[PDB]
């Protein structure tokens, strides 16, 4: 598991559960090609997106579907989605995000 | 000025100066059309991106060029950009300030929206 | 104004208005002596806490009364306060802006320090 | 384990390892009484601070020794320490912090 995504909720003080996450890899013609996707678990985590063989160097985008998350909770949000764009460089990447209705924090833990 | 961007540096404790910012707007055909661009001043602020007339309803993407910022400082950072995507003006005109606080492997972003 | 505090609300996307702020300075005997206090304006800013003369070197604690803020809004939050503790003016006078971005169970804080 | 502390480093993209953490509980005369302490592990986490029997309702302060962390890395920091003050209310509390030299983010995950 070279890539993990973890999402937290700063309003409820909880994991952000059942958040849709879409990963894309940038193609040679600069378009974004679907790569992997899933929904966060009860712990706010999404494991199993990819494998070491399939996760080659390149630019990736992780699109967290925050708008739908907030609406399912009855809350009015600002962003369409949170976006995390980075280069994978030859390590286990954890992309974390801490969500509020009008704000988000994101970090990477690369170990 | 209905759209302002402010960027801060969490390593130095300072405005993030000379940060390039590109704004896009989603077109009818669902592509990201160029909308405006500029770079932050010595206060970390970027004013003058657009006008009340040109800033219509739509889905906007504010792309803050954080990798280019850190690289100009001699630092290899994690993210390519910070990308702030939001629907604007769908209840009438509003004024938006998009703020970001930058570190090499992390950022925060918020919005202040006023009527 | 060598010390300014700015507070934003990450739920509403707005300044955090009417936030009480208490500043303390560590005394010789290691207790926290009162130094200044005030509350944020309609822009989320608090100016006028102290003067160049009174703002000497020392260890300062800026206590932002976030629980009192959220409770006044009818919300039960996690933290009692946000507490920003730092050495000031130890290389000569500087100007400090302490900023905070508030959510019910979380906050961020940064400093902008200028000469 | 009713209380866990996790600390991350936003400069290096890593857990913040060997950070000293001191917990205090507010006493009846409003002083802060030492309660528990430890150092974060290789994962940035500090487990085993207290037990359910010893962690009663009250106001607690978690003081993360960020200044010494940054100095051991050769970096010049702003804060003396990060402070997280909260009421425990009768759940497993995780206090997380994301550190930069001039800034920190903190959240609670209460599950
Ligand atoms: O908004 C300002 O004018 C500002 C001025 C100084 C420092 C920060 C500022 N904003 C800000 C933005 C984020 Cl994203 C954040 O996390 C925190 Cl704590 C603050
Ligand atoms: O909580 C975790 O396990 C975690 C794991 C890896 C990276 C970050 C983590 N949490 C976290 C905490 C804060 Cl204060 C924050 O702002 C952001 Cl974005 C994330």
DSSP state string for B41-59:
-TTSEE--S--TTT--SEE
A97: CA distance to ligand 2 center in Å? 7
Cα B32 to chain centroid, rounded: 15
Q: Which residues face C74 on adjacent strands? A: none
Q: At B70, give phi and psi (nearest 5°).
A: -65, -40
Residue A45, chain C, CB below 8 Å: the answer is no
Classify the phi-psi angles of D8: left when phi > 0, otherwise alpha if psi is within -120 to 50, otherwise beta: beta
- Spatial separation of the C-alpha atoms in residues B77 and D13, rounded to whole Å: 9
Does ligand 1 have an atom closer than 6 angstroms to the CB of B14? no
Local structure of D77: helix, strand or coil:
coil
Cα D97 to chain centroid, rounded: 7
Q: Which fold has domain B1-115?
A: Immunoglobulin-like (2.60.40)
Choose the mutation target among B12, B84, B110, B114 for the interface with C, i.e. most C CBs under 10 Å: B110
Choose the mutation target among C7, C8, C11, C102 for the interface with A, i.e. most A CBs under 10 Å: C11
- Spatial separation of the C-alpha atoms in residues D15 and A98, rounded to whole Å: 16
- Spatial separation of the C-alpha atoms in residues D84 and D63, rounded to whole Å: 6
- Per CB-CB distance under 8 Å, the chain A contacts of C9 are 102
Strand-pair category, D45-46 with A103-110: unpaired
Contact D87, C71 (CB under 8 A): no
Q: What size, in residues, is chain A? A: 111
Nearest to C105 by CA among A13, A54, D40: A13
A6 is in an annotated binding site: yes
Contact C8, C103 (CB under 8 A): no
Q: How many CB atoms lie within 10 A of CB C95?
A: 14
Q: Which residues face C8 on adjacent strands? A: C15, C101
- Spatial separation of the C-alpha atoms in residues D11 and A109, rounded to whole Å: 10
What are the helix and strand counts (H, E) for chain A?
Answer: 1, 9
- Spatial separation of the C-alpha atoms in residues C110 and A8, rounded to whole Å: 21
Compute CA distances C103 → B107, C7, C97, C110, D59, whole Å. Answer: 16, 11, 20, 15, 19
Q: How many CB atoms lie within 10 A of CB B76?
A: 10
Contact C105, D108 (CB under 8 A): yes
Which residue's structure tokens are 């005369």?
A: D29
N- to C-terminal Cα separation, chain B: 12
The full DSSP string for A49-95 is S--TTT--SEEEEEEE-HHHHHHHTT---SEEEEEEEEEE----EEE
Contact A88, A54 (CB under 8 A): no
- Spatial separation of the C-alpha atoms in residues A2 and A21, rounded to whole Å: 16
Q: What is the resolution of this structure in A?
A: 1.2
Nearest to A92 by CA among D15, D6, B102, C45: D15
Query: What are A39's two structure tokens?
Result: 């929904």
- Spatial separation of the C-alpha atoms in residues B45 and C41, rounded to whole Å: 21
Beta-carbon contacts of B109 under 8 Å, excluding residues fewer than 6 positions away, are A103, A104, B82, B84, B98, B99, B100, B101
Compute CA distances B1 → B33, B47, B52, B95, C22, whole Å. Answer: 20, 7, 7, 7, 34
Residue B97, chain A, CB below 8 Å: the answer is no
Query: What are B50's two structure tokens?
Result: 């657009």
- Per CB-CB distance under 8 Å, the chain A contacts of C104 are 10-13
Breaks in chain D after residues (C–N exceeding 2.5 Å) = 90
B61 is in an annotated binding site: no
* Yes or no, beta carbons of B13 and C108 under 8 Å apart: no
- Per CB-CB distance under 8 Å, the chain D contacts of A98 are 105, 107
Does ligand 1 have an atom closer than 6 angstroms to the CB of C75? no
DSSP E strand boundaries for chain C: 3-9, 14-15, 20-26, 32-39, 45-46, 58-64, 79-88, 95-103, 106-114
Residue D110, chain B, CB below 8 Å: the answer is no
DSSP summary character for residue C68: H
Q: Looking at CA atoms only, how far is residue A101 from chain C in angstroms?
A: 5
Compute CA distances A31 → B31, C24, C46, D23, D75, whole Å. Answer: 11, 54, 46, 49, 39
Q: At C104, give phi and psi (nearest 5°).
A: -60, -35
Q: Calculate ∠ Cα A56-A60-A62, nearest 5°.
A: 130
Query: What are B55's two structure tokens?
Result: 């800033």
Query: What are D106's two structure tokens?
Result: 């903190």
Strand order in the sheet with D32-39: C32-39, C20-26, C58-64, C79-88, D79-88, D58-64, D20-26, D32-39
Report the CATH number of the D1-111 domain. Answer: 2.60.40.180
Residue A108, chain D, CB below 8 Å: the answer is yes
- Spatial separation of the C-alpha atoms in residues C52 and D15, rounded to whole Å: 39
Nearest to B88 by CA among B79, B80, B96: B96
Query: What are A6's two structure tokens?
Result: 């973890």
Q: Which residues face C14 on adjacent strands? A: C9
D98: CA distance to ligand 2 center in Å? 6
- Spatial separation of the C-alpha atoms in residues A71 and C61, rounded to whole Å: 38
């Amino acid at each position: 598991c070279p890539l993990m995504v973890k999402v937290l909720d700063a309003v409820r003080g909880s994991p952000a559960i059942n958040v849709a996450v879409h990963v894309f890899r940038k193609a040679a013609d600069d378009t974004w090609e679907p790569f992997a996707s899933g929904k966060t678990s009860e712990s706010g985590e999404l494991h199993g997106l990819t494998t070491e063989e399939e996760f080659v160097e390149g630019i990736y985008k992780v699109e967290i579907d925050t708008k739908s998350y907030w609406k399912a909770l009855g809350i009015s949000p600002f962003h369409e989605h949170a976006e995390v764009v980075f280069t994978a460089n030859d390590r286990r990447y954890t992309i974390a995000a801490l969500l509020s209705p009008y704000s988000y924090s994101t970090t990477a833990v690369v170990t």
